[PDB]
Amino acid sequence: DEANIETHGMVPMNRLTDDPRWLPAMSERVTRMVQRDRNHPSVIIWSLGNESGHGANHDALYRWIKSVDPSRPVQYEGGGADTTATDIICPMYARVDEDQPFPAVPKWSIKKWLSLPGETRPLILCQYAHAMGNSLGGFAKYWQAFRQYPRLQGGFVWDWVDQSLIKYDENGNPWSAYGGDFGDTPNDRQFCMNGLVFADRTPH
Amino acid sequence: RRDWENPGVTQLNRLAAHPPFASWRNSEEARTDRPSQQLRSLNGEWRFAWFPAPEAVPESWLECDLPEADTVVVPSNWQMHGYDAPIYTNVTYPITVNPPFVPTENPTGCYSLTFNVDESWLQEGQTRIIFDGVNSAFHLWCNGRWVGYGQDSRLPSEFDLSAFLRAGENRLAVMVLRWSDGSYLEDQDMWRM
Amino acid sequence: RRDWENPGVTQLNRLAAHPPFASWRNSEEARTDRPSQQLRSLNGEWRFAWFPAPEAVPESWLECDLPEADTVVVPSNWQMHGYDAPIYTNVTYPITVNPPFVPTENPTGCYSLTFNVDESWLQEGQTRIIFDGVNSAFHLWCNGRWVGYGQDSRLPSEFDLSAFLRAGENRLAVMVLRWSDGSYLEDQDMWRMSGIFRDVSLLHKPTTQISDFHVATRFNDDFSRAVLEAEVQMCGELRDYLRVTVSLWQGETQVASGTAPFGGEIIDERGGYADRVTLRLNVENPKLWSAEIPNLYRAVVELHTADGTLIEAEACDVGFREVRIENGLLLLNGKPLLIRGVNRHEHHPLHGQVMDEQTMVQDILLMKQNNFNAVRCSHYPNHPLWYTLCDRYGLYVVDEANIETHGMVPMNRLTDDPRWLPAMSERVTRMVQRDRNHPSVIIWSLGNESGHGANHDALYRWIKSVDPSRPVQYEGGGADTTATDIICPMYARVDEDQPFPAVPKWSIKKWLSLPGETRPLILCQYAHAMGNSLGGFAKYWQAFRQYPRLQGGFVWDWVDQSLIKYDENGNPWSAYGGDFGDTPNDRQFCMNGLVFADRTPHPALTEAKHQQQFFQFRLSGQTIEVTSEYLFRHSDNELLHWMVALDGKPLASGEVPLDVAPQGKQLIELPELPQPESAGQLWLTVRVVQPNATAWSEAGHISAWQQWRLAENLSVTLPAASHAIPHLTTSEMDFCIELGNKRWQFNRQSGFLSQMWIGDKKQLLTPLRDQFTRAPLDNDIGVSEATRIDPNAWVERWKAAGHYQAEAALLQCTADTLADAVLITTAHAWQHQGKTLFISRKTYRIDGSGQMAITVDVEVASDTPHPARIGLNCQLAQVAERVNWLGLGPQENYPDRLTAACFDRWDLPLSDMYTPYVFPSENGLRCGTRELNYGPHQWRGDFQFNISRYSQQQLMETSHRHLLHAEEGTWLNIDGFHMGIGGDDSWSPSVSAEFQLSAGRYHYQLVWCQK
Ligand SMILES: O=[N+]([O-])c1ccc(O[C@@H]2O[C@H](CO)[C@H](O)[C@H](O)[C@H]2O)cc1
């Protein structure tokens, strides 16, 4: 269960999440979620949101949850996937064997990440294998690694369903539309369709 | 007050959050998760008018239905009814980055509902309204009197309407802003509705 | 909007918090910290009107001066101007508890000021107004237009007035609410006041400006190298020609300097902060800051163009020091601290909560002179200057967020509520943003007495995350929760556990070792100095020096919060709770300081100075071993003085230079000394004197002392046979003894000495009778009240047992003549409700020498509460100018608070023998006395005594010192034994067993003669 906090388009990404003036608004997004959903057994992990860098507001909120509900781990991927605001190493799109050493927030091979000096946490990717169009090449490589390494405990594929929307042609027939098809601009075109299933639930 | 351009105000008069309630008055119903007579749905046909900015909404709407409004189903996203375009942007925000401000042309959906309340609900106890999801911020009035305000498009906003309703017909008016300072915290890679 | 009843709205239009700015436009003025033309004070004469509620405020006020207004000085608390009464309540809130609402009747102070603003300030840049302190919430208008709103009475609120001002005459209007939802977080034990009580200023900044800066100092392992890192942020248009230079000065020498354009390193996938830059300066062999030697450098941050044109400069004092907790010990510069601290409220008896530099400096000097090295800001961020003074004079500071919700039930009702997390967060975050560059701040605190809630844990982590350089502490919830890096209890005792449910207060020695515990322990409050108190203070210091992890504490507290009131005649007097018609109130609980409100010391201050001494001593033969407890300096401004005296008469003395390294020792051999000429006890006294004046002490200051008994030669010299033999005259009602021109009369029905004459002059106004009670101290009363008796308090146990009502019943009174003397023998019982409480058996032996030897043997029933004292008392007919005694002194001392007193011959004016505690009680005792002289009388023995113009009866019946009146004559209380005074707290019996009069049978003897 994940708080409704994402500030991906800020530069740098944690510009708001490291600003105390934004701690109140973020706090309500985390606290009101926990107060509503904490009795559901299906929720096993709380998340602080997504792609909002790593700011001190995150560490404050991670601790609040750990204090009010010790029954479930807290994870959060921003700022490099292994910061002080996460009980689980939870990268997005880290590869199985190939490192991608970006500055500041490298995305290590998952096998290598588990054993970096001093690391001991489990690793479960928050997002992996981007199912956009004809894709999922290399899927089996993740599963072979998850079964061989105890601490590689899986992941969440990106993602379930295409976000295509229906439009109708001049003859009234329906067709699947993506970014820019409503006159929207700027737009990110077909990047809104990354699912294992089509928007009507037919499988890819 | 332009509360939708102030991250220090994310709500006004909102009740505390809590787990799902239904206020059953029979324990067997609560055991079996049967419908509760104390939890009524207001889903269905509502009145709706679109405006390009909150400054364009006429004061008359607070007190009476706008003849120009249409009748539409709620819950809904107004883009899906054709009133304006949904936007698909991944990382770049759909509005200029200048927190906590938003565009002055800020699509405003004016929703209203005339509905009945039995006196039995008003003679004793508390009657609250629950909006499970309103995107992205809104003000609420009941029988022309302002009730409160809320942000966070993905959690319920609840308000005590006990002192605002009367037996019989009542009218709610909800002014929904497309953009607000809460939009700075809602930059997920998905259609912006 | 009623924003003052909505914790979700703590401000509107307020600018971000930041460290102290002055917008200098000359770098040298920034380097020297001189007044800046761009920072103006708006302090002075303002207009003011009081209203009973914001609804009563006229709209005309926004536009123009209300004719009914008065002209008053600002800063001020409007209660100190007599507009409404200040309220003294300790825990119970001063308003009904119904968060987040406040009373409809809510005193509103309407302040306004008409002032000029230069066009130069408006033609370019930003002009903001800064309110350093507004209690408790306020709205601001400028030229009739609304600007904004603010809460948190203890941090500055700032607003941009650029668009609201016009060149020339402008008018500000500030509507201040006494009560607001902020009040729920401001329930500290102090007077509840309101108003614009800190400075109001105008700051002009350029549009392109320094908006924040953080300075850090990290070191290598032996502190021989440091890196100064300064992160600087800007606001305004970024341009490639912009630059920041940070330069570091040691006095007039430039130590280091670095310049860079804006553009920080990559932070995450979206890049870095193009509006910030970090300068790193290397510093070799830095001079380190500590409270022992507060070495400071000056950091100057200049915002300028590449061509060299200055835009503005900001600056701060920098102290190179590292604070860290390692292996269970709080270290400063790698050495473990011993905190000799005190909590200090911001209080002035005439100005209320308004602070001025002179009072601050006075407090600092008294602190340092009394061997304090640290201060806790109980319980809110202080006026800005305080930190400047602590940085420069050298005091370690605990900076504490303004959050206290003591009166909630349970105490964490709001702090465990997420809806109050935002309001609490602003009180912590804005304090850190303001004060993080001050070196004197070594520990952050999350507030006080607010239980332990999840909001604390969230804020504890926030601080740890933004400022790893300082530990975080917090006492609520049991003192050792997950929101504290230090075990920091209040009033936990040294050896005695107080196992309260849920939040027990363990003995501090035991607390350190509880299963799994490893943190250091520093009491955030200990030894409650209310009234005649500080009993047992030495017990804490012996434990702090023996246990490495016991690192000291902050005494409760510095200064009494009494306020001045004026009588019919216009003369001033010290007032406490209830004296302004405030009710409910907590009476004298607002006076708990080591000093009176006017800064005169209470006798307890000396005890604190001695136990907090930085030099310890031992003696072995002719050798004195001096050990230094300084961590960083050698004793380069100290010499040792020593003196050997017999019964007060100096026989030998000298001086020796002290050269002791920090934590080192120096052995000093005393010279062999000649045998003494007469009988008696020889005493050695040593004192550490600082020959040179310092920034906080005068030349000659005594910083430490210690005494020891050396040889004693007992007197075996047979007196010398009296010239005459006293005569006994027996009558039905009296036994009279005559010797020379002296006569003594013992009444046969009372069994006491009723009169004594020297010639024809009577010496007594009241007979000499045993006394087993004392006018109750604040510690004996505790929280007991007539209206709500605490049967466990000492005074109630004594009352209930009949100690104050028991009357002497005669058992025996006989007289015998011996070869050279007359002997009177008496026996009395004191009873109550048929119970014998005490039996006093005495002999009075009057000899040819005119001396009267009194032997007293008392029995005290085992089941009665142990008595306050076992002594005699009388009202002497005459009054004399001085009191001279051979015993401990010179100041007041009690059995459990006498370590600072020295055995010597003392001589003071009679009034110095009375301690004017605001709430009167037993006072002025001196213990360990072998001889007392007053007028022609001399008493010899081994006793404790007090002497003054006030009876114990009067003291006990009088609740304010200004209402005491000198009785005829002089009341003398001479005790064989006196109970300790206690003080670990002032609400539960705190006199340690070893200071209770529980022996059952007591003996003492005195000789009364004439001199
Ligand atoms: O190439 N880029 O610059 C780039 C930048 C950001 C990207 O963000 C990625 O986009 C994905 C698109 O479906 C998902 O939203 C994912 O959560 C996000 O990390 C992906 C690529």
Ligand SMILES: O=[N+]([O-])c1ccc(O[C@@H]2O[C@H](CO)[C@H](O)[C@H](O)[C@H]2O)cc1
């Ligand atoms: O006896 N009580 O019920 C009682 C309750 C609360 C008490 O609080 C104590 O009061 C002191 C008085 O100066 C200080 O304010 C101290 O911070 C507080 O703990 C003290 C006694």
Ligand SMILES: [Mg+2]
């Ligand atoms: Mg595009």
Ligand SMILES: [Mg+2]
């Ligand atoms: Mg808002």
Ligand SMILES: [Mg+2]
């Ligand atoms: Mg009707």
Ligand SMILES: [Mg+2]
């Ligand atoms: Mg994203």
Ligand SMILES: [Mg+2]
């Ligand atoms: Mg408020």
Ligand SMILES: [Mg+2]
């Ligand atoms: Mg308190």
Ligand SMILES: [Mg+2]
């Ligand atoms: Mg009272």
Ligand code: NA
């Ligand atoms: Na595995």
Ligand code: NA
């Ligand atoms: Na996508």
Ligand code: NA
């Ligand atoms: Na110690």
Ligand code: NA
């Ligand atoms: Na007090």
Ligand code: NA
């Ligand atoms: Na010296």
Ligand code: NA
């Ligand atoms: Na008294």
